[PDB]
Write an enzyme that holds these catalytic residues in place. Structure first.
Site, mmCIF file in Angstrom:
data_model
loop_
_atom_site.group_PDB
_atom_site.id
_atom_site.type_symbol
_atom_site.label_atom_id
_atom_site.label_comp_id
_atom_site.label_asym_id
_atom_site.label_seq_id
_atom_site.Cartn_x
_atom_site.Cartn_y
_atom_site.Cartn_z
ATOM 1 N N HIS A 292 28.734 16.960 -86.789
ATOM 2 C CA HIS A 292 28.782 16.026 -85.652
ATOM 3 C C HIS A 292 29.254 14.571 -85.887
ATOM 4 O O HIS A 292 28.705 13.628 -85.335
ATOM 5 C CB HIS A 292 27.411 16.024 -84.951
ATOM 6 C CG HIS A 292 27.036 17.331 -84.327
ATOM 7 N ND1 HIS A 292 26.450 18.349 -85.040
ATOM 8 C CD2 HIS A 292 27.147 17.773 -83.054
ATOM 9 C CE1 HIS A 292 26.221 19.368 -84.231
ATOM 10 N NE2 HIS A 292 26.635 19.042 -83.021
ATOM 11 N N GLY B 186 25.315 22.287 -77.445
ATOM 12 C CA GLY B 186 24.869 21.370 -76.414
ATOM 13 C C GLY B 186 23.381 21.089 -76.603
ATOM 14 O O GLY B 186 22.992 20.455 -77.598
ATOM 15 N N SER C 131 26.024 24.630 -83.521
ATOM 16 C CA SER C 131 25.102 23.588 -83.097
ATOM 17 C C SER C 131 23.962 24.169 -82.248
ATOM 18 O O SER C 131 23.148 24.959 -82.755
ATOM 19 C CB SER C 131 25.833 22.551 -82.307
ATOM 20 O OG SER C 131 25.177 21.330 -82.446
ATOM 21 N N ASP C 132 23.878 23.807 -80.969
ATOM 22 C CA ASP C 132 22.776 24.347 -80.216
ATOM 23 C C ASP C 132 22.961 25.841 -80.246
ATOM 24 O O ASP C 132 22.003 26.606 -80.039
ATOM 25 C CB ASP C 132 22.733 23.813 -78.790
ATOM 26 C CG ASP C 132 21.377 24.047 -78.142
ATOM 27 O OD1 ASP C 132 20.369 23.742 -78.788
ATOM 28 O OD2 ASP C 132 21.325 24.543 -77.019
#
Lengths: 1023, 1023
Positions: free
Chosen positions: A708, A880, A927-928
């Site tokens: 990120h 997200g 990620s999420d």
């Protein structure tokens, strides 16, 4: 003044490379260098064709290089020509739609997701007739394609990753090779990421940092016999390219050559090449931020790190005499203004008198300031920083004085009474340290007595404090009016309109002014007493809504209201939140609309002037007395003037400082930051374009070796973005006519899920496209280009089908059709699962963990949850933050039923899955998406199928932009899983059953992951 | 595909030249070619500095290359840098503000009129600190400056003149040389124009066509020993440049070298260099022309030779399927439209049905069409051409049928009755062949009986005929209501408001409908009779004004009115004429405004829809019933698509065709045209940019060897014009501060005639400019640039004068200040003349023969005409057409006086000069300026002093633009002087007394022409 050189390619003694977003060619033999192509936009890649004559070029357009397409360059005549009109979506980290390689016959093969439902699905296509036709290779997603002894070599995710050094996640570059004219085998799959593969002789050379730093390595065509050929230590090497004899690459802004037969490496000499004008002009509104109304009807505003005092018309303008980085400007007096000046050391309070010209600037460091205000009497200022402190700064001396510090979040919501005696602010707090919600109570600070009082209780969210002019009552807002609103699709409820205003009289015994209690009947005339003032709190009789501000006036109260709205546009298109300014008459208790289409509002010191911003992005100003007489604030009458190099240094330092200040681990940030500063700073002076600075900044961001770390927005070019004409159809050049090969459609009854041709009552599949808007398309006419030029309008399309079946329709030509392709894909897989399980298994796909993910999940969840089994496909999931909300639904265990006199059973819970669940994931879910994946296994919801996921689980919450709009992200929130620690970071999540999706799987048109998913559930469903 | 190469320069073996508006360098030694500077705008000149390292470059900006400035290029580091912020005014023929040469010390000397009142006053300046300071050489106007043996060689008007071959007028290039460190002598003054001078050894080489064609010649430094070195016959040679050994030049798009020591000439080999994308996108509104309303609320409009049928929103668009050059489009029926297609052979009528798609196109040539209309019943069309014919074209077959032909002008004002039976049109006529005024009578053609009737008498100007829907009455307008309006300044009167509407009932015995004669009292019910219908004419009771259209409706009449306004903006700024739509209620006879700020209006077939254009350039549409509900017609939703090469061919052919069709002499036009077509057509395919095409087109225009062959407007670049910051002051870099060297002022009480600083009550002369908007200016800060960036706004300027005299003012920074310099100059000469003649002589200057000349002439005339003598300076007079109106005033002989009881004598005539007149003229006064000059002598008004004038007296009246906006001009009206024939053309007017203004005159700060004028009159005034 040397230039930054990058992304090279070689052919014999000629070497092409990029400099100042333009393409250059250099001759080793003579040492001459020349620009061979420019003014096309930002070029990041160029590739020689076999013959070494033509050159495939990838060029980006759109202020933020949001779009891209390919061009051809013929060195013979110097002809340039656009080849693709796909307008591919790209981002710094994922610069998709590029050259993939060349086939034996010398044909160009490109990689693009332009016709795919997912951006990671960068499928291989063979370019024909210069863009007239595209032939799919059906080898699945790929970045590079090479050819060795009639064997296809596939490079998956083999692009460079400068923003994440030492990456070892599931999406790490890997190499596959053909072994049997269709059979593929993975031959290079190291612990780390492999990029820029090339072949010299019978060895594949690539780059990797398996040893701690980027170096060039190679193996035979079996992935055996690994060898390290370089020992760099200064800067990672990048962009390998070759002609078959020598290998070319860039490093630290220079071009190097590696001769495999000698293992010798040398820097090519280029020297100064181009030094454009340092002084540049900019449109102030383009980078405008912070707009505030001053006395005398003047306006102050910040833009590109500069500040200005001007009249509304923008004819009389004064620049604040202060070096780069002014963050904020605020009315400080009749002709004075306070400002916040930011430097590498931190933020500082400053004052400037635009009448006399004087401008002192305190030296006391305030930290990283995010809010600032000055008392009406110009005595002191109030400031909030990232240390979660609220303080007052004596405008006379400069001495800051901390009032209070929160340990949860910043204290940016505050106000000062007109008599300068009290300071009311929202104070974030938590009941427990691991509490999932942060509460916020209003606090009041009394300059006399210097004591803090509690204006409100700490059980919810209180905000937007505001004093009345007389300083007798404190008004504010709260989300305490709990009342649920029903969901129209899912059995659910949420708090949408629970905002209400409240007031608190500063003098005990005094009543709520808006209650209109007759003065004769109230015995006021008391004195200030802020003790237990939260007990005297009272609401004002206004319908609950979603208020963001309350302004108490003499016989009325202004309130800013935001109608309930969806979040999709704001989440994926930066769409601003639309509000309206309401007026509440204290006497008649009647509410009315004063101004709509608002996106922001500021109010004068004397409460007489109102400044606002509307949904059109423009700034307006109107008197509170006659809101019908608003004027538009003009700011572009005068050019913004700046120095490229001064900004570049400034921006680099800020990016570097943010990366350090926000990294989730402070200790690590201390060492990493200090150890990379100078190294990357030395390259800044070689940058002349924004793209140049980007190359430098991202590389320094990669030093954190964490996920990120992005760079979004910013102004890199002034070229209009590429456009693409779409009608959700796939064309095939058959003979000298285009034929609709496929006509995409998801749910015919939903909005925007099918080709616009369907609205005329016919399926275009199989038809021939004769022409578009009177222009014949076909063998000699690029249909992609013609559509490109009609995007956003309707064009007359002539179609021909079975027999004399001829149609003439006005077709809407879309600017994009990704969503249509996506939903089509989902419905296809959904139909497939129902047919293969004989109607016994459901299917749901989750594209991301944002708003779109919430839409799609429920869109199918409500119809697919009651089958014997359920497949939850989260492949390509962009992450997200709503994985937890979805996991909660899938966690619902069905334990009851409802038996009606008439009708059918109702399951309890309603939102529960009926049977067995099976999850599918791949290296493109991250990620999420990583978190959901790990979670599914952890909670035992079912088996997880696929391939290890991305591995990026350190989230972000940006709160600062560079002076040019650029939004940088810093991995600030490390996710920790119980019984795994931070381990998922830089690794991902392993599936219970690994099911590769090899290139030969794509060649056979079969999805092995979904098949296994189905087969597995079927096997589990025999009880 | 070779490129067009031009404007070269040489230094050793390196040669720089221009290609595709970009600068290229070529190495004779290696044969390598490369682009060394691009994307700056259009470059037309580049000059090597002494050392051969830096390069001075002239670049143009603004869509029409209306602006220009100079840049430096350092080949060492590749640095570019703007040197001048003068934003010099330029035109194809006069591309001013350029490199003049280099001094011995290696310093750049430029030529520019940027700080002068006249564009021809291109004075010499020595560049310092890269634009920080400019030192005047005071050698007067000059194009080239060379240095031979410490002697300054001056080249006046020595730029190329491709648009006028064989030019022999007073402004022809001449060369002067210094003979005594200040003394100058003219050494080259041939019959023809001399251009591009250079020195190799001890000889001056230049170009001239004294022999009939362009060739290179040379003479010694005394102008003696003339020699011809070339014998070209294909294309004129241009742009001579040298390094001291060899001479470089361009010809027919190639670069050649001439070695003086060998007299050998050879073409340098360059070959293909750049071939950009042929397919280009354009904004339709940018080139939009002709906008017409169709049935069903559709719109039709022409743009860049293309036509389109679209809805008002511009979302549904249809391109008419017809090759380049559609001139007009008109409603032809429900879903049909008639259009005019233009080709090299001429104009043709065509029809297109946008519903079915069919589109036939007749082959009958209509000539050059300038008007077209279709009857409401779609049976026939009406067309006007340059043969002065009005005709009907059977829309079924295509057979044209001439109704009538005028022998004075085109019949473009016509209308067709709703029943398609009559055609009313204005018929231009003259009473005598040599009559100074062309009258216009309305004629009516009856399709039945096929006879023409006179609707009106032929004593004035009748126009804008319009039938009422019932086809019973013919309405029209006239300028017959003579009534004078007084002039506010000069004893004069003119007809401003003399337009009035009239009507004519088609059935005798029927009254004027607007007279509201009771029906019961009128015995109508007759039949059509157009005999002596002009006798039944009747006016409508509407106040006289300036009407441009009348639309008779049921119970009202719409009228288009144009308020009286000045002509300056329209004459020099292309400002459109503002009108307003009025409504006349037939019943109440009351008039009201329906819509203002209009610039054009069209009306629907059914008279229900109104389409207009407003002063903002945008197009609107509103229902005649509810004009408050107008919508904006959007046309830029879809890009315009075209082919560079197809348009270039088209444009060249059109330019060539106009040049032939409009040349004043038909015989000549036949031979010249046919003899140059192919020659210049062969270069078109080498053109890749608009500037390329211009080089080709202008050269073909020069073949007419006549004056007034220009090329104006057009789109050459998309770069914003250069800006310049002005305050009507001259700065001098003294020490490290700028000092106001001069503060310009004309008449302090007029508008715009002084430096804006004067408004603060101080003369800035002598003050030091400390800084502007907080930014210090001086030794290390180019004030020209700082001002450049503030142009058009007010900036805070800090000034310092005598002692502690410090000022801080908000100064308006002008975009231009030429007019202020001009009037300052005029008032200076005027003061001078009054002082030198001891108050006995007046002075007047005439800048041009347009509106500005009319202003200036009277501005002084009213105060300077009553001295014993009067000087009428018409030097630098730009021409126009009002010389006759001014000569008329000067012709007035005073023969009487008026004796009052109180007060002073009044002269009769009032507009008469009191005593002797003396005229002053130079080679920069031309055209109407030539006419005025010849006239003054011919009428014996006084002696003419100065130097022979320009010599261009063949006037123009353009009536067509190229598809890109370009306005070309053709010398169409040869001026003939009794007792001189056309002689003045290409020669000019010789003064009675020749008074050169040599370079040493300028060095001594003396105006010899004005001094002689004064001295001469003084001598004449001794009686």
């Amino acid at each position: 003044m040397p230039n930054l050189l990058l992304n090279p390619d070689i052919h014999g003694d000629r070497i092409i490379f990029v400099c100042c977003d333009d393409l250059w060619e250099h001759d080793l033999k003579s040492g001459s260098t020349r620009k061979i192509v420019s003014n096309l936009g930002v070029i990041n890649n160029a590739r020689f064709f076999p013959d070494g004559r033509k050159i495939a070029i990838r060029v980006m357009r759109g202020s933020s290089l949001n779009t891209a397409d390919l061009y051809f360059y013929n060195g013979e005549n110097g002809e340039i020509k656009r080849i693709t009109y796909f307008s591919g979506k790209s981002t710094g980290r994922r610069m998709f739609t590029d050259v993939a390689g060349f086939d034996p016959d010398g044909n160009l093969i490109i990689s693009t997701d332009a016709m795919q439902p997912f951006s990671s699905m960068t499928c291989l296509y063979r370019v024909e007739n210069d863009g007239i036709n595209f032939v799919p290779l059906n080898l699945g997603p790929a970045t590079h394609i090479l050819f060795a002894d009639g064997r296809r070599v596939i490079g998956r995710n083999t692009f460079e990753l400068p923003h994440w050094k030492g990456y070892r996640g599931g999406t790490r570059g890997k190499i596959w090779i053909e072994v049997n004219s269709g059979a593929f085998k993975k031959i290079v799959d190291m612990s780390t990421h492999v990029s820029s593969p090339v072949i010299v002789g019978h060895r594949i050379y690539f780059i990797t940092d398996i040893d701690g730093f980027g170096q060039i390595y190679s193996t035979d065509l079996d992935g055996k016999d690994l060898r390290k050929h370089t020992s760099f230590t200064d800067y990672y090497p990048r962009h390998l390219n070759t002609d078959g004899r020598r290998i070319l690459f860039s490093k630290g802004g220079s071009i190097y050559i590696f001769n495999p037969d000698t293992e010798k490496i040398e820097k090519i000499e280029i020297g100064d090449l181009e030094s454009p004008e340092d002084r540049i002009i900019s449109i102030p509104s383009k980078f405008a931020e912070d707009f505030s109304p001053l006395d005398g009807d003047l306006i102050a505003f910040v833009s590109r790190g500069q500040a200005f005092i001007q009249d509304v018309s923008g004819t009389y303008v004064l620049k604040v005499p202060e070096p780069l980085r002014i963050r904020y400007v605020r009315r400080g007096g009749d002709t004075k203004v306070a400002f916040i000046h930011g430097t590498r050391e931190g933020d500082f309070l400053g004052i400037y008198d635009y009448r006399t010209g004087k401008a002192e600037k305190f030296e006391e460091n305030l930290g990283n300031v995010f809010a600032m205000g000055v008392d009406r009497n110009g005595k002191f200022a109030v400031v909030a920083n990232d240390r979660f402190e609220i303080m007052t700064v004596d405008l006379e001396t400069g001495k800051p004085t901390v009032i209070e510090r929160s340990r949860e979040a910043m204290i940016t919501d505050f106000t000062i009474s007109d008599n300068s005696r009290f300071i009311a602010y929202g104070f974030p707090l938590k009941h427990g340290e691991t509490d999932g919600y942060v509460m916020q109570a209003i606090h009041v600070y009394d300059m006399e007595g210097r004591k803090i009082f509690a204006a409100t209780t700490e059980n919810s969210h209180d905000y937007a404090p505001a004093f009345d002019a007389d300083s007798k009552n404190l008004y504010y807002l709260s989300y305490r009016s709990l009342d649920p609103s029903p969901d129209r699709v899912v059995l659910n409820f949420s708090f949408e309109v629970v905002s209400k205003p409240f007031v608190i009289p500063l003098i005990p015994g005094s009543p709520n002014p808006t209650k209109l209690v007759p003065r004769s009947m109230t015995s006021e005339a008391g004195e200030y007493d802020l003790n237990d003032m939260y007990k005297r709190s009272s609401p004002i009789n206004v319908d609950p809504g979603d208020y963001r501000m309350i302004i108490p006036l003499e016989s009325s109260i202004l309130i800013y209201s935001v109608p309930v709205h969806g979040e999709f546009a704001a989440y994926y298109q930066g769409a601003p939140e639309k509000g309206v300014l309401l007026k509440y008459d204290v006497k008649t208790r009647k509410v009315t609309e004063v101004k709509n289409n608002l996106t922001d509002l500021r109010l004068s010191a004397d409460r007489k002037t109102v400044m606002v911003r509307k949904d059109d992005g423009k700034i307006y100003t109107f008197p509170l007395e006659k809101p019908e007489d608003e004027r538009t604030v003009e700011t572009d009458k005068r050019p913004l003037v700046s120095s490229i190099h001064e900004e570049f240094l400034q921006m680099y330092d800020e990016a570097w400082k943010l990366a350090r200040d926000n990294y989730w681990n402070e200790a690590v940030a201390k060492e990493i930051s200090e150890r990379i500063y100078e190294k990357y700073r030395n390259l800044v002076p070689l940058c002349k374009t924004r793209y140049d600075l980007s190359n430098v900044i991202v590389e320094m961001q990669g030093e954190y070796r964490t996920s990120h770390s992005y760079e979004m927005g910013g102004t890199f070019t002034d070229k209009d973005p590429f456009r693409s004409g779409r009608i959700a159809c796939d064309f095939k050049l058959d003979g000298d006519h285009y034929v609709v090969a496929k006509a995409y459609a998801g749910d015919y009854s939903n909005e925007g899920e099918k080709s616009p041709i369907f609205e005329y009552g016919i399926d275009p599949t199989g038809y021939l496209i004769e022409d578009i808007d009177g222009e014949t398309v076909g063998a000699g006419s690029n249909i992609y280009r013609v559509l490109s030029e009609k995007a956003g309008t309707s064009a007359r399309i002539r179609l021909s089908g079975k027999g004399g079946d001829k149609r003439d329709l006005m077709i809407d030509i879309l600017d994009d059709d990704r969503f249509i392709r996506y939903r089509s894909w989902v419905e296809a897989n959904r139909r497939y699962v129902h047919e293969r399980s004989k109607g016994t298994i459901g299917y749901i796909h989750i594209p991301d963990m944002g708003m779109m993910g919430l839409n799609e999940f429920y869109r199918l969840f409500i119809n697919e949850s009651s089958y014997q089994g359920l497949i939850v496909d989260v492949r390509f999931n962009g992450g997200g933050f709503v994985s937890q909300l979805i996991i909660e639904k899938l966690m619902n265990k069905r334990i009851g039923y409802d038996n009606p006199r008439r009708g059918t059973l109702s399951p309890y819970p309603t939102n529960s899955v009926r049977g067995k669940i099976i999850a599918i994931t791949n290296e493109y879910a991250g990620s999420d998406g990583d978190i959901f994946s790990f979670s599914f296994k952890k909670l035992g919801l079912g088996k997880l199928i696929g391939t290890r996921t991305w591995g990026g689980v350190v989230g972000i919450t940006p709160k600062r932009r560079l002076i040019d709009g650029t939004v940088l992200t810093q991995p600030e929130f490390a996710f920790w899983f119980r019984d795994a620690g931070f381990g998922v970071e830089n690794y991902g999540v392993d599936p219970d059953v690994e099911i590769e999706y090899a290139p030969h799987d794509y060649l056979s048109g079969k999805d092995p992951q979904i098949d296994y998913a189905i087969d597995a559930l079927i096997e589990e469903l025999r009880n």
